[PDB]
Amino acid sequence: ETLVRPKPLLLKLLKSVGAQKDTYTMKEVLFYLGQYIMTKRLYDEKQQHIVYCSNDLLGDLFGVPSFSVKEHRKIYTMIYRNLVVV
Amino acid sequence: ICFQAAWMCLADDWT
Amino acid sequence: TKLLNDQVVVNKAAVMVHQLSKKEASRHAIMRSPQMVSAIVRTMQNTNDVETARCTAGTLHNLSHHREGLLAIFKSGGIPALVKMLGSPVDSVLFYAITTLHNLLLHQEGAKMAVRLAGGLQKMVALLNKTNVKFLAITTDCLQILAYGNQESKLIILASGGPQALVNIMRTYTYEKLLWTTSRVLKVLSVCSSNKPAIVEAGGMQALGLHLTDPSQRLVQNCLWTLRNLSDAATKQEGMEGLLGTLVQLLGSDDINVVTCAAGILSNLTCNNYKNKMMVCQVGGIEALVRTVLRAGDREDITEPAICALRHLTSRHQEAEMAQNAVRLHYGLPVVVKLLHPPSHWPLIKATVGLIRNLALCPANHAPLREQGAIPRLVQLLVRAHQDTQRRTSQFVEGVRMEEIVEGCTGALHILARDVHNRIVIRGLNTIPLFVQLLYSPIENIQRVAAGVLCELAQDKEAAEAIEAEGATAPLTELLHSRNEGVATYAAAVLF
Ligand SMILES: *CC(=O)Nc1ccc(NC(=O)C*)cc1
């Protein structure tokens, strides 16, 4: 359990799926992303490791046209910027 | 589920 | 003395008694004298005047430096009156009352009880807001005479706001005999854990450790044996960039009782605050803790906090990747796994597996963890801890929950199962039967990593055959509604 507030860009991702708070235990952040990418069907049914976040809001947070879920540290870096640090 | 398994496995770096 | 047995003449008679009570061979019969001391005492409290209240108690100190006048004041009961004259605005009185009381707390039994009965504790703490270091140093000593060997007194120092005063005594003055007596007082108020949150919450620990250069070796130790206890509240406190730099530098001091203490704080201070465990990674402490385990050896009191601290640093923050890499660039991976082997006890092994689990987060560490012989040593203890839990039904021995060795070892095998070569080792040791026997465990934390380690094994088509031949059709099926979300996610992942 670790509390930290997301930057307003990411705060709209969790609002648009079912959240309303500001202080997230750094799990719901991933959780409501695990529903933002799973509901809109943003992956590739052949090889679902890849997330096609092109013409979509998710491409504005992580840069990049596409990426892989197995690139753990690359996506975690994309978290700590849309997230309040010192 | 192939995306569900890998993404849940991404959440294993924070646990 | 018939003088005393009489508000204008006591101003006179208490002078010549002050004079007669400085020569040690001429003050022999002025203390061993009955009524004279009795008539004083009460004309000190029931007084409006100043030079009366000054010269009244002005002789009480002069009566009180031989084993005669101390008893004459006690036998005539002045020890509950002099604590009324501990709120006197006359700075003379406070230096004629506190100086008097301090003598009654040296060679006088029966005063330690009568001072707490009268109410001097809540009075002497209201006096630690002065600036005359003579007054601060004497009064703080009186508080270490009443607190040592008494639990009912330490709590009276609590409610009196005593904890925070001694913190700002450290935070301000530079006089050692003040800072040492204050450290003498601050420990005995921190050995029992009802007196500890109110110390750190007043900014305590970042003021005790405000002494890094001070050649008073009976003071730095008197500050480090305090922080080792008060660590339970710094888990949420912040603003310690000047203490961590002090502590992380002391992981190499010539004494072994500071390496034991400085590491004992960093563990119980990085436990779950995102910044401090990201601060020692910004001062270069991720290395100094390694070359501290390299220094210890078979001394568990050092490695366990130096591992738990290193366990806290290698997971769940931004600067965690260098914490997982730089532990091997400084040659830790050989010595890390060699702590699992005997004679390390369960507390260290628990922290040791937990580190390796976090150490396997980085991909480059997968093989040097494999090549150093860690995969067998995990199941070598995963089987002993598991088969001990069963023979009890279908509890803390040497301090461990025992079942944490099951979650810790299975959770560390699940991360290393990401590497394909390690799966030939995890399966090549006949552990698919065991991992399935953990899906039935009533504990929530054990089912996740067990359902997760099979999912990493099942993606090998060959290894998926054995699991289905294990009787794994109901465990990873009845877990499909697990409130603990992770259990159902992997259980369905294996099923498919
Ligand atoms: C389709 C499928 O189940 N793929 C699969 C994907 C990922 C993983 N493991 C991790 O992501 C850690 C196992 C199996």
Author numbering:
A (entry chain B): 25 to 110
B (entry chain C): 7 to 21
C (entry chain A): 157 to 162, 165 to 552, 559 to 660
What text appears in the publication on this structure?
Here, we report a general and rapid method for discovering α-helically constrained (Helicon) polypeptides that cooperatively induce the interaction between two target proteins without relying on previously known binders or an intrinsic affinity between the proteins. We show that Helicons are capable of binding every major class of E3 ubiquitin ligases, which are of great biological and therapeutic interest but remain largely intractable to targeting by small molecules. In addition to possessing increased stability and membrane permeability, Helicons are capable of binding large, flat protein surfaces that are inaccessible to targeting by small molecules, and Helicons have been developed to target a range of PPI targets in cells and in vivo. Characterizing Helicon-E3 co-structures and mechanisms of action, we identified new binding sites for α-helices on the E3 surfaces, as well as potential probes of the disease-linked E3, WWP123,24, highlighting the generality of our approach against this therapeutically important target class.
We screened MDM2-based focused libraries against β-catenin, a key component of the canonical Wnt signaling pathway that is often dysregulated in cancer. This screen identified hits belonging to multiple clusters, including C91-C93, that bound β-catenin only in the presence of MDM2. First, we used a direct FP assay of ternary complex formation to show that H329 and H330 from C91, H332 and H333 from C92, H334 from C93, and an N-terminally truncated version of H329 (H331) could all promote a cooperative interaction between MDM2 and the Armadillo domain of β-catenin with EC50 values ranging from 10 to 100 nM. Finally, we performed x-ray crystallography to characterize the MDM2-β-catenin complexes induced by trimerizers H329 and H330 from C91 and H332 and H333 from C92. Gratifyingly, all four structures confirmed Helicon-mediated ternary complex formation, with the Helicons bridging the p53-binding site of MDM2 and the C-terminal ICAT-binding site of β-catenin. The Helicons from the two clusters engage different subsites and residues on the surface of the proteins, revealing distinct structural solutions to cooperative ternary complex formation. We next tested the MDM2-β-catenin trimerizer Helicons H329, H330, H332, H333, and H334 in this SPR assay and found that while binding was detectable, each of the Helicons showed 5- to 10-fold weaker affinities than we had determined using the in-solution FP assays. However, we were able to calculate that all five of these trimerizer Helicons could induce ternary complex formation, ranging between 50% and 80% of the expected response. As exemplified by the four trimerizer Helicons that drive formation of ternary complexes with MDM2 and β-catenin, a small number of specific residues within all three components work in a concerted fashion to stabilize distinct PPI structures.
